[PDB]
Amino acid sequence: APVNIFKAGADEERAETARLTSFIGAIAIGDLVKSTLGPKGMDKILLSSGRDASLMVTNDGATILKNIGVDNPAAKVLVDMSRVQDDEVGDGTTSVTVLAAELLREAESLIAKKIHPQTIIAGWREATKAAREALLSSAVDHGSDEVKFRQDLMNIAGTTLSSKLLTHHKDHFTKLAVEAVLRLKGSGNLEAIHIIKKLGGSLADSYLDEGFLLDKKIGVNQPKRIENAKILIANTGMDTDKIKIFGSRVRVDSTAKVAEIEHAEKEKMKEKVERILKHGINCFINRQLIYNYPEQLFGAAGVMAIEHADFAGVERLALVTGGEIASTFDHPELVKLGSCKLIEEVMIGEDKLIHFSGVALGEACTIVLRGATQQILDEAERSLHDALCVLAQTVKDSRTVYGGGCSEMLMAHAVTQLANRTPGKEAVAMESYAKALRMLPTIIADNAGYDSADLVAQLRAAHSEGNTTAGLDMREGTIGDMAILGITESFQVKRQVLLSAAEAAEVILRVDNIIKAAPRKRV
């Protein structure tokens, strides 16, 4: 195919530069986000060449790979791998990128050993099957005795926020992340926790609101605070209805009848508001816009009117007040109203927001992130999003494993025990699978500046004879017990790091020909 090429502007390579470009392009992705892994790793700042560059600092490996725009074909497999890891569990996107790159780096070492690439695939399938049994047998469940499960949930949020910008804020941001999912008391919808980013103040000034915050302040001549009110929301049109009959006009003979029709239009718009206040309410939230004619009617009756909050803002108010959407007002005995105590307006960062203090059945939260710059607020929002998504799945799957390098040495030990019970064809591929699992505590140990040649060697000697909870202590720089220090991760997060990296390395290693087509508008 290179000799006597039958292509126009397209090129290809077979078994010489195919695996060469696949191993170079995938290691350079993994070596890029290598410095961001661990609780002592640095962060990246992403910039463009111009034309609203919109600089966005991120430490999470999914947000780095989704914005760099790699031109390598085999590197897009690892870029899409970190996107699925953020969409499923929301954590380990950096850990699954280095692990999939360390598998292909050990596969580059098997180039000169003349090992068949299908032997490495069949050797890694038996290695990944033994690695699933190491995490499944070491998972710690939590059913009853809930005072130890809430302590276990703070160890999950303490491990996730340690590898982010919120380093010296674990005394505050752990309570902001555990109690946010604990106030859901149900499914992890991940949209009732509305994060509001406001400039001014430090990250210690951020807090979790006991009620709910909103924008689009209360009318013009309406009351600003009503105590012991009944909140009724809506999703209906207020004025300029044009009610659902396309092709309907007002064909009259004189202009005196147009004055009678427009008075009949305002009488039906007034009668719609009169059906709303028969419930006995004091606040009104409409998803659509409220014009001036129903605004005067709510202001004359002493009723609030919040106009055009959000499409998903009426869903959070329905989960924090315990009511319903109620888009049709014709049955006051079948419409459930919300409950609150204070609807006072608070000022956060020279902006008046509507505080719904003292609400009943409040299965929704509002995190008020305050930072020094907008770059910190964009990073702390993604750092909190990577912490709330794991706790939303830890309450659904209570199985937890010991992180901090302890889980990877347990997975590498089960592969090494079965590497000695195999013939020599697939045993060399299983030894490279166990060395790549030991690189994940090696990257964490070397990012702090510790002796990674000795600490991982002490972890391999500890896990070889007992010590199932022995891991890497990044606080002092030694080997400690992970059950005492409280460094644990979720089982489903660590399983998706192991499983998705083994499936993505299976695709790139099986590629022997990269036939790229002719691009458009590139000359």
Binding site: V220, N221, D239, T240, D241, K242, S248, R249, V250, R251, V252, D253, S254, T255, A256, V258, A259, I261, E262, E265, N292, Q296, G299
Partner: protein
């Protein structure tokens, strides 16, 4: 001072409105009834007792027509147009209007 968000102009609705003229005297019933329409709006304003009107800036239809401007000048009423929709919060808190 009174803040008015109504448009003192010809009668029109949100729906499509048309006038059918099929008679000789029907053209007289269009112009003279439009003058009697806004005269009932000016005399409703004049009998209230206000001297300063603040009309909100309308985009869809005309807020203050030329026919409505002449009746308000004979009632000795100062009329101010083009008040923005984002400025009505500052006006109602300062003067005390609704």
């Amino acid at each position: 001072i009174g803040l008015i968000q109504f448009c003192l102009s010809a009668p029109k609705t949100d729906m499509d409105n048309q006038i059918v003229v099929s008679d000789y005297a029907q053209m007289d019933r269009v112009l003279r009834e439009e003058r009697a329409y806004i005269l009932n709006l000016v005399k409703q304003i004049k009998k209230t007792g206000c001297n300063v009107l603040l009309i909100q800036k309308s985009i869809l239809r005309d807020a203050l027509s030329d026919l409505a401007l002449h009746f308000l000048n004979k009632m000795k009423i100062m009329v101010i147009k083009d008040i923005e929709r984002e400025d009505i919060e500052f006006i109602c808190k300062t003067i005390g209007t609704k």
